[PDB]
């Protein structure tokens, strides 16, 4: 039996034990994953020792994703830029490989709920660690084009550049936009406490497709903004938490689990 | 979705989860063990939370146990006379049942390696909460006697005074212990941090079972020890450890799991 588990504090509210469970059984693995709560200055030796003890991969949750990308030998392109790695693997040779999910997971669901990405034009809000950790896997499902705005432009200047090379990455500051885009992606948490930016709402129109990492019961505040100006579909963020679980299964395991029965289920969790 | 969780800090890798986990596959139980951190303000403070929230049982590591034993608003007997609780379970009415396994657990990894109680003379090196943990449930196989030993004579001579009524306990110095037992048991640390109690081996003999609550990659010093000396069988706290869970299992799902395949396991990961 294979050992997995999700490293965190706290980790009470994580559902990737119960994702996971589910990912083995779907495709029959002999491997058990459980959340493990660790001190806040103890991260390193808890993973260390997860490993000694014959641990074949984990999960970082916060507050862990830093120290994580340090404590990885090498990382993949994705972890790379996003500048954290919320995936641990032990390979044959001893080494951790260091990886990032997150993004990835976003695409896959958006798949899923059958957007278009490619030859598409993308406004992502926010400049954060999320923004940060989703612009490669998009950028691979090679959109027309890529903007990235943030309250302070500054913030929003430096990570178009960072992935300016990759494709059409344009940066601009919220008082900036005056045109519609194909998807609308909202990496900002600042709506759970109903508040929305400050941006015209030119940017959605009827061919738009929002979608709000954050997520809950009915629609988040900010796809009902979104739906208020002629979004024409609207997803939140729990596609985005199985998808990155199912690229992490995928990295350890070889195989993509279905996540469409898993994710309905923590729907009616939810609601 | 039944929520169940291991307490201690660290938490050092509990395998409490592993274990409890794979107790929920094969009895096929609706139900999801966690290993939380417990706050430096207290566990009083992460107990009312997480049965706050829906929890609906958990175990609890040292040193909190006897943390737990106030936090329950009802114990079992087995835990009073353990004077700490390693599981606590919501009952029906929303109070707080305190019990302790670990004694249980002992007992019953004793009888599956075929080892009689009843009538056996048993030895128990320590008086610690360990040590105060295992007496009762020992006491109920009823053997012919129970020496408890430690380093210092005072205090194994209180904890065989404090069970003394419940069977034929007596106490003696590591120093003094001068003939064979049937069954040993070690409740010390000694085994973790590489010594042997200043007893001499005499205790062992051909026919004696002893039994260690540590465990490791191969057999523990105290193990090794007790076979240069020509044991009859040596084992270590594995199956405590299991066994332990099991009863919590079953008090909270009123089902028991079984053991042997998932100490199996546990024990190939020890083996490297
Ligand atoms: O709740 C969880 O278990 C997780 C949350 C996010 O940080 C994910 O990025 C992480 O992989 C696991
Ligand atoms: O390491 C663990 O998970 C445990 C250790 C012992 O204290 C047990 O008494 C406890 O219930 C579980």
Redesign the interface.
Known sequence: ?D?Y?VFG????H?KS??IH?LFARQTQQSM?Y??????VD?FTE?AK??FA??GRGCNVTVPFKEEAYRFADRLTERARLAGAVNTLKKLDDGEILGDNTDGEGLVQDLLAQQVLLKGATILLIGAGGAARGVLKPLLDQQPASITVTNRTFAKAEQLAELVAAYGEVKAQAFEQLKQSYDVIINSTSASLDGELPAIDPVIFSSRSVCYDMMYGKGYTVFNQWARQHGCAQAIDGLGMLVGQAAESFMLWRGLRPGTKQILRELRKNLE
């Open positions: 039996i050992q588990a504090n706290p980790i009470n994580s034990p119960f469970t058990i459980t959340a493990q709560c660790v001190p103890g808890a020792h997860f003890q014959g």
